[PDB]
Symmetry: C3
Subunit: 256 residues, 3 copies
């Protein structure tokens, strides 16, 4: 289960059915939960906590220090939840003290080859980061979001739930929930109706979100004006409230 | 032949004469390696996979992994690499899926540069160059002598024409006709690869005929049906123009404009 | 001790006494490593290659490989890295070609972040930052304090000026003058790096001269001939406008506009 060619630090805690492949390093203060398979040629650094039924593939560096010139060796953390797939050559950096000292990943996330998750980023659940997606730092990715290949995200951006970025997008402003963005710089194109159908949203909820999109994007309304007008629809449909909350929380401005 | 003793060779693996495997490489079950093939250190080969003769695979490459795109993998799906290919550092090459071809296929004399990605069910021909960080999403067909420049991204189901050229950072969502130069995200057709035609020793008359073939398709407001009819005489006279005409006729889902 | 027993050190390797080499790393023939330098695990160092003092090279880096460029034919070419450099996860640095000066050179205090690529015959200065996935095609000159943000792509023979800044996803095909800010694919000149200069301790007067300098080249309709003339005067009063004027003089590919 633990390959003999692997290096397991004395201070690392592993669960019973944890598999570690050859030429992998499990460093000091790395906990790894039940059902988790660490491939060959993985480097894990701590303090890091990994959940259960996770798969980390070869040439991944999970829990390295950020090279960000404001980090200075503080004992910052990385937390990964359950049922995640981290593919080949992914880099995940621990938090910085300037902002909560923790990088967090939720459950059922799929982080494809050579993706980069920067210091202090927060991923939710059921997210897909396609190959070479890069989160600069302090990026919040809400549940069910899809960032397509080579999507670049500037520090401090919020990517809303069920949002979609096109391949090679460069995001500089918050992406609201359900919104589709494309290009460098990314600009909003529509709502992720496909994404909503893929979760059996009530058709009334899809029609409600289509209306909400128009209130914000296609009616010359200011953000305050749009939020005001979304109030009733929000209180009526919890689906619309996610959208409403994602704009309200974006006082860095929204991706247009 | 030199098999590094720090390598892991699965007992079901088959190595031909003069195969080298560097330290800390894995040749997994049902991997066949052809004569004179050099596997570097830190390579992961997974099967079922057939690699031909006189290949070179560099460190940190993962060759014959399963696509992450399916949660519940099907087997058997295959990867076939031919002869005299160079696969540089960190390249990822996924096997096929049961849904579709069940096989990812690379021909001969290809150069796949560092951190390139070849997705499931893709088909590469001969004498192609995929520059660093080129990414084929899946079901991509790259025909002979095509050059994808650095950080080219190709949507699933796209055909990249023979002797075509994509500029660095291009994102291709439609078929690229043979010989055409494309640039941008999203990719736009700019001109023809006249440089490659000359480098490959095409005649000035074939080059001139292809310069006119481009104008017929792109600059005269013809339906593709009408462009194809306008090219039929040129295509009959020049096999190089028939390759162009064929790549346009085979593009049911439209060409990069 | 300091050399991990699981590392491979070639007999013809010269390591200073306090040099750390982590497990499953290779130090190839004719690799020289200077005092203080820490080599991580799973690193491949190939020669002939000189690494200076107090360097740090992270896992999955390939430092000193041959270029795949078809114009290299196995000649004895080198790589030189200076002191106090940080090379992160998965970086690729290729050695020179005989067609230039047979050397790839890196200076001191450089930060080269994950999966960056430094191609054959590139020369990096001092205090540069190459963010994740930056790619220099080859013969690229990056001057001191340049920052290339993530996924910056640089065409061969391009010069990146001192104190310049390239935005995420930039694709540079023409020289970037010193102090200039560029964004986009293709790259576009979008003023000068005033924030970097102010923080670097440049004088109010130098910044003001540079603003007029920028107008001379970019906003007055002058040619490079014309504009270089017009800078002479200011180039005398300030070193900075000299560095700027020099960057425009040496621009063999034209300048980013
Ligand atoms: C089946 C499908 C419709 C899905 N798809 C995928 C795609 O990138 N579509 C797209 N993005 N931006 N504009 N279009 C690729 N895909 C992928 O995950 C994929 C895998 C490797 C490389 C890449 C690339 F080229 F972008 F670097 C992508 C995926 C993942 C989630 C959602 C959609 C798509 C695609 O290309 O065809
Ligand atoms: C290709 C696939 C069968 C799988 N898939 C994807 C998915 O998120 N499935 C899922 N939903 N809920 N739980 N799992 C999203 N996806 C996709 O590739 C995808 C394709 C077209 C359009 C879109 C959308 F909604 F964003 F416009 C996405 C992908 C890529 C890799 C792995 C899994 C999946 C999907 O929707 O169809
Ligand atoms: C000598 C040459 C004329 C060729 N060339 C190369 C190039 O990228 N040209 C180009 N791309 N997009 N637009 N033009 C790079 N090159 C390369 O192989 C190369 C290597 C590393 C990184 C990159 C980059 F920058 F694109 F990420 C490229 C190559 C390979 C085949 C054909 C042409 C070119 C180049 O830059 O100068
Ligand atoms: C703190 C900061 C203002 C700086 N910054 C950084 C950035 O790339 N800014 C930027 N690029 N183009 N337009 N803006 C990211 N950053 C980084 O080094 C960084 C780290 C990981 C990934 C990336 C990405 F996604 F672009 F690949 C970048 C850095 C390094 C030096 C200077 C500025 C910035 C950023 O996003 O927030």
């Amino acid at each position: 289960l633990i390959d003999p060619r692997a290096i397991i630090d004395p201070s690392a805690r592993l669960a019973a059915d944890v598999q570690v492949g050859p030429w992998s390093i499990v460093g000091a203060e790395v906990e790894i939960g039940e059902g988790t398979v660490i491939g060959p040629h993985v480097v894990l650094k701590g303090p890091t906590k990994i959940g259960k039924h996770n798969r980390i593939y070869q040439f991944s560096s999970v829990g390295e220090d950020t090279p960000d010139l404001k980090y200075k060796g503080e004992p910052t953390r990385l937390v990964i939840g359950d049922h995640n797939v981290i593919r080949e050559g992914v880099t995940i950096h621990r938090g910085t003290v300037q902002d909560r000292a923790e990088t967090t990943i939720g459950d059922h996330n799929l982080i494809m080859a050579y993706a980069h998750i920067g210091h202090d980023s927060v991923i939710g659940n059921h997210c897909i980061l396609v190959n070479n997606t890069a989160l600069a730092g302090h990026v919040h990715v809400d549940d069910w979001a899809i960032l397509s290949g080579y999507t670049l995200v500037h520090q401090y951006c919020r990517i809303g739930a069920h949002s979609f970025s096109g391949m090679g997008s460069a995001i500089g402003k918050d992406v609201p929930a359900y919104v589709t963005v494309f290009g460098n710089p990314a600009e909003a194109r529509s709502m992720n109706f496909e994404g909503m159908r893929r979760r059996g949203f009530s058709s009334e909820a899809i029609h409600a979100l289509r209306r909400a999109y128009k209130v914000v994007y296609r009616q010359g309304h200011t953000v305050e004006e749009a939020l005001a007008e979304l109030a009733e629809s929000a209180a009526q449909f919890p689906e619309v409230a996610v959208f409403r909350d994602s704009i309200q929380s974006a006082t860095r401005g929204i991706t247009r």
